[PDB]
Amino acid sequence: SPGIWQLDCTHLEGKVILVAVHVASGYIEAEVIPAETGQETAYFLLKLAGRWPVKTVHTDNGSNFTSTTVKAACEWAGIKQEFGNKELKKIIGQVRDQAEHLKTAVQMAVFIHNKKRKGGIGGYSAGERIVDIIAT
């Protein structure tokens, strides 16, 4: 569907990388947080939902169902939380020393994941795909 998203954790240099995937397109948004609190998760969902149609967020774990802020962010924004890739880390390792902060390398790797052509040569990007789907 157009507004389906998958939310995930990944970890690096002892920080948490939050990743949202638009399932139909492959487009990603990521943010690095100091700590894995639900407060930070809730602000990232709020930003996401103001930038895109965010109807349903899937999570693999239980941590998102026990944060009152997240619950209140989803209600205000109209997000359905429901229970039930890592080329990213390859690219972060490529750029990691051409900028100091990990967060920057993450966002450089998000840039590349979203903009490249899905697989190399020919097709659309994750970022083209998401706009198309939503246009319809």
Ligand X SMILES: O=C(O)Cc1coc2ccc(-c3cccc(F)c3)cc12
Q: Is 49 in the site for its own copies (CB under 8 A)?
A: yes
If the CB atoms of residues 9 and 77 are measured against ligand X, the closer one turns out to be 77
Q: Which stretch binds its own copies (CB under 8 A): 13-21, 59-67, 85-93, 128-136?
A: 128-136
Whole-angstrom distance, CA of residue 58 vs CA of residue 45? 12
With both helix axes pointing from N to C terminus, report the angle between 87-95 and 102-115 in degrees, rounded to the nearest 10.
120
Q: Does the protein bind its own copies through residue 92 (CB under 8 A)? A: no
Instruction: Give the list of residues 6+ apart from residue 13 with CB closer than 8 angstroms, or none.
Output: 102
Query: Which residues of the chain form contacts with ligand X (CB under 6 A)?
Result: 39, 42-43, 46, 69, 72-73, 76, 98-101, 104
